[PDB]
Enzyme design. Structure first.
Site, mmCIF file in Angstrom:
data_model
loop_
_atom_site.group_PDB
_atom_site.id
_atom_site.type_symbol
_atom_site.label_atom_id
_atom_site.label_comp_id
_atom_site.label_asym_id
_atom_site.label_seq_id
_atom_site.Cartn_x
_atom_site.Cartn_y
_atom_site.Cartn_z
ATOM 1 C CD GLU A 185 38.972 45.762 45.652
ATOM 2 O OE1 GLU A 185 38.161 46.917 45.296
ATOM 3 O OE2 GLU A 185 38.358 44.735 46.398
ATOM 4 C CD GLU A 206 32.849 45.397 45.314
ATOM 5 O OE1 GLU A 206 32.903 46.314 46.421
ATOM 6 O OE2 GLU A 206 33.370 44.291 45.455
ATOM 7 C CB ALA A 245 47.275 40.013 48.046
HETATM 8 O O1 LIG Z 1 35.492 43.619 46.446
HETATM 9 C C1 LIG Z 1 35.872 44.257 47.475
HETATM 10 O O2 LIG Z 1 36.713 43.697 48.305
HETATM 11 C C2 LIG Z 1 36.998 44.395 49.797
HETATM 12 C C3 LIG Z 1 36.634 43.387 50.679
HETATM 13 O O3 LIG Z 1 37.392 43.511 51.789
HETATM 14 C C4 LIG Z 1 36.128 45.601 49.938
HETATM 15 O O4 LIG Z 1 34.814 45.482 50.146
HETATM 16 C C5 LIG Z 1 36.601 46.437 48.489
HETATM 17 O O5 LIG Z 1 36.000 47.726 48.655
HETATM 18 C C6 LIG Z 1 35.761 45.677 47.480
HETATM 19 O O6 LIG Z 1 35.847 46.240 46.216
HETATM 20 MG MG LIG Z 2 31.721 46.738 47.806
#
Ligand SMILES: O=C1O[C@H](CO)[C@H](O)[C@H](O)[C@H]1O
Ligand SMILES: [Mg+2]
Ligand SMILES: O=C1O[C@H](CO)[C@H](O)[C@H](O)[C@H]1O
Ligand SMILES: [Mg+2]
Ligand SMILES: [Mg+2]
Ligand SMILES: [Mg+2]
Ligand SMILES: [Mg+2]
Ligand SMILES: [Mg+2]
Ligand code: NA
Ligand code: NA
Ligand code: NA
Ligand code: NA
Ligand code: NA
Ligand code: NA
Lengths: 1011, 204, 193
Positions: free
Chosen positions: B127, B51, B129
């Site tokens: 990332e 991010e 679920a």
């Molecule tokens: O996009 C995201 O989702 C998760 C949300 O819990 C958390 O912030 C991870 O670090 C991030 O990359």
């Molecule tokens: Mg983040």
């Protein structure tokens, strides 16, 4: 701390890089490019003091001027004012190699200036100072307070002095270090100088300002439509009322305009750039930019309130042109370029590395007048005005990052090290941020001679990412690595491979087709023009025209880096490496140009002009076919002049208008010509002449020429019988012949013509004898690093075989009386330590006409190194004002460098027959000569010659041209054969085989007579 | 193995990553990681961070890695998850069949993403679920797609363990605490608890 | 300088990164992965003192242990010791967004340790100290003399101590800053410790 010994610190408090600003507050002035009251020059007289290390600088300095300081002009290189010595080193670093440290004695230039600032500048906005070039690193204080620090000698360092200044009188104190960790990336092959060598300026900008702007131009398929896109970023007070207006003008006519509020498009989950805006202007039928016709428009960028208040305006010249590589070809505006380039250092024989407008203009004129269309910024960003000039006059430019680490071992030791990535990246990134809007720059280069490191791939990628409009090239590590869009070798030969391990230099023709290879090939350096050189130049041009993917190259290089020194009598003389006490040094290796340091041309310049012609010609009977190599322009300022002459005697001529489209042809039928029955060879010469003057040339400038032999009428005319017969008188020591007011004396012990008289006057100071050697040219010597030494070089091979010290042994000398002549026959053997190197057999035939016909036949041992020349020499007693010859000329020309010379009847002052190369050598030869006239003498045959007041022995033993002394009389070297001069590189044998005197047996004939 | 670079709170997200002045600092976070971890066999892929939008420093760093260590793919999700800085389409929270066509950085259905014109890379979700509290609904839907589509090569659930912290009540009895529980503010409350397991490792 | 407010200075005097080392002097031990006497852990009990900002750290801390410091276990996050609060923010940075600066009120943990070395290390060889993780940036001193600085809370920072070591007792002083310009690149969705 010692920030100057920490590559992790290349600046402190330095402002971001950006394109040239002036902060105009009136749009018409920005449009006109007139001066801006918001941009002032701080150039002028400063105070300066030299110290031997930063630790000797007294504290007081910060606060006040040192009594013992001097007033000097800035910009300047302090070595130029005598404070210390410029050093001339090629590869080996001038300091001990131990990154990132530098020596404890490190020359420090303390510069200072008291200047004024108007209260108005301080009432509002921001006042910054800009140092265009400081070599190599520096600390800066204002009014006794520390401001910041900067590295990278070749790009501007800018600092905000807003909080440091006061109304009225102010004082800067600049502590400049000659050596820093930055020096490890500044190992270019040039004089090692230092100081504030580029402009210093003061710029006022508003608080809410244009902090950067990028201009792009994209085209439709046939270039009939374009879209100009300008991305603008601001700093400061962001408000809804702000707008940007970009207007584009062609002359005083506004062709397009767009206005928009700030806030760019969304780019990610967090939104977009609310401090940025992109304007898009449609332009129909844009006039395109090229080196052939540098059409420019003016883009004016106004930052203003919506209701109409101009905040400030920035601007730039815009060249609509697209650069792209497709299918293996580098195309400009969709056509394939042919780069007639040259590498150019910023060098002035008096001011060192300080550049000035006049000099630049002068260089650009000479470049274009000599058919160059491109330049490579070897090896660093140049003075900012250079680009403006290339944009306006029209030259393609390769903008090169100031990164060279040649002396490291291996060469990529630092560029492959991540710890050096930050320092390298700033060198690449700030260059692109400053120069991206200039149309002249068509290719970016990552630096030079730094091996190939992973830092190069990362940086290659960065640029491809921020600026997709230009290819990226880089030669290091083999010239065709993953860090270059173009195969860009240095000194790869045309047909001959040099298969060095790991970084071979293949023949260029072969390189293009290696399995899997598809990129275009453009040499970043070729045709090393050191001293008497450029031999083989034509071979390159022939290949470039025949192979589409061979798109040219940049000759090395434009101007010799000689500096002026002054003798006891205060007369100026050209100096090179070691001439300032500097050592180690590389001697003359810093002089490799097409022009001398004062811009006077070397003879090789004319060969480059010819080979780089934009019109090619073919001849078929009465028809001349002209072909244009221009890609974009018609021949709208050109006429073809033609002349036919019989052995220099003009017979007919004329002019015909040239109207050839780019890449097109025109056939020209010549009128019915003479049919003279009179003996001799007819020669056609045509010249392309520009009838109107231009921005870069005068009316009548000749841009191209070519000659052809037409018919020849061999002479069958028998010369009349003489009412006379020479008489021979013999003695044990001589053979003497007399004929009227004439006499010739042949020495029976030496076997040579020892004296001749015309009337009662002696003609020779030294006897006429064979000569097989030449005072070695820089290329014969081969060195790129001043003890050492290459046994394979020409000079060493001849020395070792004994050519320079061989002694003539007489084998025979006889005299015979003929019916209407006397004949002398001789044979001599030249030996060395028991080895016979050459055998010279001759006949001298003196007839009742007073003519002496000399026939010579030489044998050369097959196992000895091919000799430099096969000829005769002598010191004439006479010193004549002029030299008149029928042969190739008028300038000096050698076997492998004579395409530019034309056969005609030439007549020059004696001194024009000598070329004052800084480092003396054999010079002034003229080939293809059929008749030579000097004083009362005349020589006829088919030979090459040189003639001057300096012997080969003298040239050979003197190191600088200013130390030469005219000898009594005139030395004349008349050769039947002379070896090529070479030059593909100047540090290995480079004379092509076909220009080697390897035939084993040589025959030549001359007739010597009086007139 | 992922570099320690996250600039999520910037606006827009690539504000720093597209700026050359930040290249040196980002660069060390990527190169020192490679220098340290390159001989471990378990590391199969390098990641440029998280991010941080998509900036030119990312392209530079992707390339650096590719030249220094050709043995492993490099991935990065920022800026749209299929940028020039990633060898793997590696979205976060892209759905199986449902598209979420956000401007600039859409999250296509994973099945659809694969076949976009000219696209040929493998897709593995960095990332998916989001296991926050009573969650994991629809998990089987992912698995069925992964199985049917060769180029759908799985993903990494978010995430393994709740970041809850222990606090003690008046009596010294421990309790699970979250954002704000320490007087910290601003804070994002329970958003730090997204695991498949409780902080003490007891499963959800 | 406030090296912690300058993205161009991410370390000072830090040694180059490299794969895990142990300097084993016996091949068979290196083969079996057993311990190396050339690699020692300084984990354990250290002296620690908390300050509201680096400007509040007394110079004497360089030369001697502060009477008010406490003795704590290292490694540790200070918030877990109750010195200050851990903060839980997702997106929004925990400090004002104004790169490269950080708040003037910047919690500072002063860590110190008294130790000594094998005589042979005073003899020859290079003795370095390795900090596998310090959040967010820090300055290092040994026997009162400044050694270097480091950023990047998640990779090891190593410094050569060879020239600073002395016979008998030696003292490390580590000044760690909660926030630094490195924080700008450490915005992960987790507790800020
Ligand atoms: O996009 C995201 O989702 C998760 C949300 O819990 C958390 O912030 C991870 O670090 C991030 O990359
Ligand atoms: Mg983040
Ligand atoms: O290879 C090279 O040759 C030239 C020789 O004069 C000069 O050293 C150039 O800087 C270098 O790139
Ligand atoms: Mg430095
Ligand atoms: Mg207007
Ligand atoms: Mg006012
Ligand atoms: Mg070099
Ligand atoms: Mg810092
Ligand atoms: Na070509
Ligand atoms: Na040179
Ligand atoms: Na014409
Ligand atoms: Na000489
Ligand atoms: Na699958
Ligand atoms: Na979360």
């Amino acid at each position: 701390r010692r920030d100057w010994e920490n590559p992790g610190v290349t600046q402190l408090n330095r402002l971001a890089a950006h394109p040239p600003f002036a902060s105009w507050r009136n749009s018409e002035e920005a449009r006109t490019d007139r001066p801006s009251q918001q941009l002032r020059s701080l150039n002028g007289e400063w105070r300066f003091a030299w110290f031997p290390a930063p630790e000797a600088v007294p504290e007081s300095w910060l606060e006040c001027d040192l009594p013992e300081a001097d007033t000097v002009v800035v910009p300047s290189n302090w070595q130029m004012h005598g404070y210390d010595a410029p050093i001339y080193t090629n590869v080996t670093y001038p300091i001990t190699v131990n990154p990132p440290f530098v020596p404890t004695e490190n020359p420090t230039g303390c510069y200072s200036l008291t200047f004024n600032v108007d209260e108005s500048w301080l009432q509002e906005g921001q006042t910054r100072i800009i140092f265009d070039g400081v070599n190599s690193a520096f600390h800066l204080w204002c009014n006794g307070r520390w401001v910041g620090y900067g590295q990278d000698s070749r790009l501007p360092s800018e600092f905000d002095l807003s909080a440091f200044l006061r109304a009225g009188e102010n004082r800067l104190a600049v502590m400049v270090l000659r050596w820093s960790d930055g020096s490890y990336l500044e190992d270019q092959d040039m004089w090692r100088m230092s100081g504030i060598f580029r402009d210093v300026s003061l710029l006022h900008k508003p608080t809410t300002q244009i902090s950067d702007f990028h201009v792009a131009t994209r085209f439709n398929d046939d270039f009939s439509r374009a879209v100009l896109e300008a991305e603008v970023q601001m700093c400061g007070e962001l408000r809804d009322y702000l707008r940007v207006t970009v207007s584009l003008w062609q002359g005083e006519t506004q062709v397009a305009s767009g206005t928009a509020p700030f806030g760019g498009e969304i780019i990610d989950e967090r939104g977009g750039y609310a401090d940025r805006v992109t304007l898009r202007l449609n332009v129909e039928n844009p006039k395109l930019w090229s080196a052939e016709i540098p059409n420019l428009y003016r883009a004016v960028v106004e930052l203003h309130t919506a209701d109409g208040t101009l905040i400030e305006a920035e601007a730039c010249d815009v060249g609509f042109r697209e650069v792209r590589i497709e299918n293996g070809l580098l195309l400009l505006n969709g056509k394939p370029l042919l780069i007639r380039g040259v590498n150019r250092h910023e060098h002035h024989p008096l001011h060192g590395q300080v550049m000035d407008e006049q000099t630049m203009v002068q260089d650009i004129l000479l470049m274009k007048q000599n058919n160059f269309n491109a330049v490579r910024c070897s090896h660093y960003p140049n003075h900012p005005l250079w680009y403006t000039l290339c944009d306006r006059y029209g030259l393609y430019v390769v903008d090169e990052a100031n990164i060279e680490t040649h002396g490291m071992v291996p060469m990529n030791r630092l560029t492959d090290d991540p710890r050096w990535l930050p320092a390298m990246s700033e060198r690449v990134t700030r260059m692109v941020q400053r120069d991206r809007n200039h149309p002249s720059v068509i290719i970016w280069s990552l630096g030079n001679e730094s091996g190939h490191g992973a830092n190069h791939d990362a940086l290659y990628r960065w640029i491809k990412s921020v600026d997709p409009s230009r290819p990226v090239q880089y030669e290091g590590g083999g010239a065709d690595t993953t860090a270059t869009d173009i195969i860009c070798p240095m000194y790869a030969r045309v047909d001959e491979d040099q298969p060095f391990p790991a970084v071979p230099k293949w023949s260029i023709k072969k390189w293009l087709s290696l399995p899997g290879e598809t990129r275009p090939l453009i040499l970043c350096e070729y045709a090393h023009a050191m001293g008497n050189s450029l031999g083989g130049f034509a071979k390159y041009w022939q290949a470039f025209r025949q192979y589409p993917r061979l798109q040219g190259g940049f000759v090395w290089d434009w101007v010799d880096q000689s500096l002026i020194k002054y003798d006891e009598n205060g007369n100026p003389w050209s100096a090179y490496g070691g001439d300032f006490g500097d050592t180690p040094n590389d001697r003359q290796f810093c002089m490799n140009g097409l022009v001398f340091a004062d811009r006077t041309p070397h003879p090789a310049l004319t060969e480059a002009k010819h080979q780089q012609q934009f019109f090619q010609f073919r001849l078929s009977g009465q028809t001349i076919e002209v072909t244009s190599e221009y890609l974009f322009r018609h021949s709208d300022n050109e006429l073809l002049h033609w002349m036919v002459a019989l052995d220099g005697k003009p017979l007919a001529s004329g002019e015909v208008p040239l109207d050839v489209a780019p890449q097109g042809k025109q056939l020209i039928e010549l009128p019915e010509l003479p049919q003279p029955e009179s003996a001799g060879q007819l020669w056609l010469t045509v010249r392309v002449v520009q009838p109107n003057a231009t921005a870069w040339s005068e009316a009548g400038h000749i841009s191209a020429w070519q000659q052809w032999r037409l018919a020849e009428n061999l002479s069958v005319t028998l010369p009349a019988a003489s009412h006379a017969i020479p008489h021979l008188t013999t003695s044990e020591m001589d053979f003497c012949i007399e004929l009227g007011n004439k006499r010739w004396q042949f020495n029976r012990q030496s076997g040579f013509l020892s004296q001749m008289w015309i009337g009662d006057k002696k003609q020779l100071l030294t006897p006429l004898r064979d000569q097989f050697t030449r005072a070695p040219l820089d290329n014969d010597i081969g060195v790129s690093e001043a003890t050492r030494i290459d046994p394979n070089a020409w000079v060493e091979r001849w020395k070792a075989a004994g050519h320079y010290q061989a002694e003539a042994a007489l084998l025979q000398c006889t005299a015979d009386t003929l019916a209407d002549a006397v004949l002398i026959t001789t044979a001599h053997a030249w030996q060395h330590q028991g080895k016979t190197l050459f055998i010279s057999r001759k006949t001298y035939r003196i007839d009742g006409s007073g003519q002496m016909a000399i026939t010579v036949d030489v044998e050369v041992a097959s196992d000895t190194p091919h000799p430099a020349r096969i000829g005769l020499n002598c010191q004439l007693a006479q010193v004549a004002e002029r030299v008149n010859w029928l042969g190739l000329g008028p300038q000096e020309n050698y076997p492998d460098r004579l395409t530019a010379a034309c056969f005609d009847r030439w007549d020059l002052p004696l001194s024009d027959m000598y070329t004052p190369y800084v480092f003396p050598s054999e010079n002034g030869l003229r080939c293809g000569t059929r008749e030579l006239n000097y004083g009362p003498h005349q020589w006829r045959g088919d030979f090459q010659f040189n003639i001057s007041r300096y012997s080969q022995q003298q040239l050979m033993e003197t190191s600088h041209r200013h130390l030469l002394h005219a000898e009594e009389g005139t030395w004349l070297n008349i050769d039947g054969f002379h070896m090529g001069i070479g030059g593909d590189d100047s540090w290995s044998p480079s004379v092509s085989a076909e220009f080697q005197l390897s035939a084993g047996r040589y025959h030549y004939q001359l007739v010597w007579c009086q007139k």
